[PDB]
Design a binder for these strands. Structure first.
Length: 16
RNA sequence: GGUCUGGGCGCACUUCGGUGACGGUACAGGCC
């Protein structure tokens, strides 16, 4: 969309 | 940052939708 900033916090939170 | 968001930016991917724990949680907001 770009990724929704919250969606950046979800990137690392998919993993950690 | 407990954590979620929002929508771009300055960059790289790609079906051009979204994917990217990159500058960077930085910006401004929710129960902090």
């Amino acid at each position: 969309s770009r990724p929704s900033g919250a969606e950046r916090r979800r990137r690392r939170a998919a993993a950690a």
